[PDB]
Amino acid sequence: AASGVATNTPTANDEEYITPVTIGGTTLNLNFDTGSADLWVFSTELPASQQSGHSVYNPSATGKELSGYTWSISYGDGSSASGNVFTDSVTVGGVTAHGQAVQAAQQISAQFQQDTNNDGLLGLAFSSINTVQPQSQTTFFDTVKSSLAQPLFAVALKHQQPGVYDFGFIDSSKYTGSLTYTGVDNSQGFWSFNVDSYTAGSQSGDGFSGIADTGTTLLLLDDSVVSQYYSQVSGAQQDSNAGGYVFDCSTNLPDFSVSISGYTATVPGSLINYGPSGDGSTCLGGIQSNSGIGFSIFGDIFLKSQYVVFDSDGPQLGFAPQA
Ligand SMILES: COC(=O)[C@H](Cc1ccccc1)OP(=O)(O)[C@H](CC(C)C)NC(=O)[C@H](CC(N)=O)NC(=O)[C@@H](NC(=O)CC(C)C)C(C)C
Ligand SMILES: *[C@H]1O[C@H](CO)[C@@H](O)[C@H](O)[C@@H]1O
Ligand SMILES: *[C@H]1O[C@H](CO)[C@H](O)[C@H](O)[C@@H]1O
């Protein structure tokens, strides 16, 4: 049976996490994304100027076209990418997926044109929302999961330290105490779970649903919850140059917790200071608005507090405080 450890590294301020992936013998640095289901890469089909600063996939060297197949994906922040499809050998953490669909980029939006930190994305959401047309393809995980010792993966994302993606096994040294599991709703292709209640510092409220999303930087919550949280942060104000609510970097931030099948998942206030806001001299908050979508995005700010098991049996999510 197979298993492996893929090492992730955060970019500056932990904006995204990058993990090396070998595709047909070329290693690319990809953004592992439990919020989407596409494995797409910068490729030799992009204009040369857009290849600069990246490792790129050359499908002609090792890939096998999926004849007449295309892909086009659009993400929450407005970014997008599109192209055509080849199958190839894809190795993550020493685990090789043979005949894995690799989505070669022909077009990339401005955001990807300005991010030289990654060479594309490796989706880890359910394969049902893979965007390949006319028939969707399986993610790296779904391709290999019956070959793994257990059909799961697990993630430790850290603040300014390398972390792990564990494929096919649970590393019990990555958390304190025992895991608490909660059922997953995969009906929209996400690792969606329910929280029974929340605590935003000195205030608490009713539950909601959200998705475990390694591809999103922040913890995105309902505006009511954001407002409740920052009402407790002295001098907090919206700064559109920075991305949302900002505050003095020396601020002692309240904790944020959620109730998950009787387990309290707590994000310490220290992790809710995302980093210098950029423009001037404030820091950006790790909690921000979900734009009114009616569910929450449990992005990297939250994940840095937990070890999280993504188990296809169920499916279910397992949580415990990171160690
Ligand atoms: C259709 O699904 C997706 O796009 C999923 C899930 C989602 C659900 C509901 C709403 C938004 C997103 O998002 P994702 O995690 O695959 C996707 C991947 C990214 C590389 C583009 N992330 C995002 O779109 C999110 C925003 C979001 N959720 O609306 N993007 C980010 O967090 C971006 N972060 C910043 O700009 C940093 C700044 C916030 C300090 C990104 C560069 C990583
Ligand atoms: C993950 O699990 C497999 C199966 O036991 C091992 O072979 C591998 O070394 C790693 O521990
Ligand atoms: C990724 O790298 C880190 C340290 O180099 C981990 O220890 C893993 O085993 C992977 O090799």
Curated annotation (Swiss-Prot):
Carbohydrate-modified residues are: S3, T7
Q: What is its main location?
A: secreted
Top-level taxon of origin: Eukaryota
State the reactions this protein catalyses.
Hydrolysis of proteins with broad specificity similar to that of pepsin A, preferring hydrophobic residues at P1 and P1', but also cleaving 20-Gly-|-Glu-21 in the B chain of insulin. Clots milk, and activates trypsinogen
**One MF term in GO for this entry?**
aspartic-type endopeptidase activity
The record's subcellular location field reads: Secreted
Keyword list (alphabetical) reads: Aspartyl protease, Disulfide bond, Glycoprotein, Hydrolase, Protease, Secreted
Any S-S bridges, and between which cysteines? C249-C283
Q: How does it assemble?
A: Monomer.
Give the protein's biological function: Secreted aspartic endopeptidase that allows assimilation of proteinaceous substrates. The scissile peptide bond is attacked by a nucleophilic water molecule activated by two aspartic residues in the active site. Shows a broad primary substrate specificity. Favors hydrophobic residues at the P1 and P1' positions, but can also activate trypsinogen and hydrolyze the B chain of insulin between positions 'Gly-20' and 'Glu-21'.
Q: What is this protein called?
A: Penicillopepsin-1
Organism, as annotated: Penicillium janthinellum (Penicillium vitale)
